[PDB]
C-alpha cells in the first residue's frame, strides 16, 4: 500500500493511526524469527483489535447508507 500511494511524502504513510499500530505488532514477530530466544517474549498482538476496527471502517463504507452500518462499528470500537 506504500508503493501505490507514494505521493512524494513518506511521512504521510509511516507515522499514522493505521500504520503505527501495525508496526508495533508486526515488527516484533519478524524479530522472533531471527532471534531464537525471543519466542517467549511478550508481544502486544491484542492491539490488532484496533487495526481490525480500522480495517472495518474502510471496508464498510465501500458501498440508510451509514446509519445502521456506522452504529455497528461504534459497537465494535467499544468491544
Amino acid at each position: 500500500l506504500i508503493y501505490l500511494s507514494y505521493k512524494g511524502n513518506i511521512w504521510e504513510q509511516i507515522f499514522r493511526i493505521s500504520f503505527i499500530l501495525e508496526m508495533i505488532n508486526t515488527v516484533p514477530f519478524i524479530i522472533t524469527i531471527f532471534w531464537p530466544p525471543l519466542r517467549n517474549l511478550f508481544i502486544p498482538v491484542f492491539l490488532n483489535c484496533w487495526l481490525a476496527k480500522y480495517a472495518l471502517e474502510n471496508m464498510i463504507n465501500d458501498l440508510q447508507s451509514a446509519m445502521f452500518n456506522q452504529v455497528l462499528i461504534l459497537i465494535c470500537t467499544l468491544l
Binding site: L1, Y3, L4, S5
Partner: peptide, 10 residues
C-alpha cells in the same frame, strides 16, 4: 505500480 495498482485501489 502498474499491475497491482489497477486491482488493489482502482
Amino acid at each position: 505500480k502498474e499491475r497491482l495498482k489497477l486491482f488493489f485501489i482502482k
